[PDB]
């Protein structure tokens, strides 16, 4: 589980003292989070699931 969305730090103060931190700017190309998993390993785990 990765997230190649590279974000900076933007702080805007709401009234006295209080600080709100939100997503700054994304550096690079636009892309999905990208979790990733194996194909065969899972298949192998599913093998005994369908059998049970």
């Amino acid at each position, epitope marked *: 589980c990765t997230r*190649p969305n590279n974000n900076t730090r933007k702080s805007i103060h709401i009234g006295p003292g209080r600080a709100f931190y939100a997503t700054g700017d994304i550096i*690079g*190309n*636009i*892309r*999905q989070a*990208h979790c990733n998993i194996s194909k065969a390993r899972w298949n192998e785990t599913l093998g005994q699931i369908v059998a049970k």
Partner: antibody
Amino acid sequence: VQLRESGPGLVKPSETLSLSCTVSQDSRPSDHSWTWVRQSPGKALEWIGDIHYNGATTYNPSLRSRVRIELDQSIPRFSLKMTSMTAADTGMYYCARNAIRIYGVVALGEWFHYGMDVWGQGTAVTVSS
Amino acid sequence: ELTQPPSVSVSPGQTARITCSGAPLTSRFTYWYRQKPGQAPVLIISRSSQGRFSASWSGTTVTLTIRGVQADDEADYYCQSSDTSDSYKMFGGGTKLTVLG
């Protein structure tokens, strides 16, 4: 980088065409795609195919019952089969590489076209019996 | 298939303008390329944002400017734009430019 075209440039009305093109040199010969171009005698241009090693069947649908694109695994030589329609527009046929340049290896994520960057010599295919 | 401009003359070392209209445009960018008389076509576009000559990504015509170059540039121009389902690229009735002098 280099492209050498082969095959007989003569076809009898209708019949079949066994057009060929060999890729001579490349640093990255798999990730990049492949396209065929139909140049009019002296008018315009027409798009053919688009073939990739993964078994991609992206092609010209205007002449869908005429398209048969060949991709050889060993060596980067490509072949094209023209069935039934050959005599309608006859002139020149060029072969060009369609660059991909993926930022991320995700096939659905960051794929784009740079266009037909590398073109070949181009052989003359004239149909008149 | 495509609404390609037939023929436009050159300005005397000034502003250059072309169109090429169609339905995709905002879908699969532009891509130009030029056919040299009796020679193999060559590169024009330098697409990377997901040389020399540039264009504006519009939904009307897109257009393209080749700077203030009068001579050294005269060939048959085209446009290759992919459909939403990667169907075809579509091309018009060619673009045969002419140089003055």
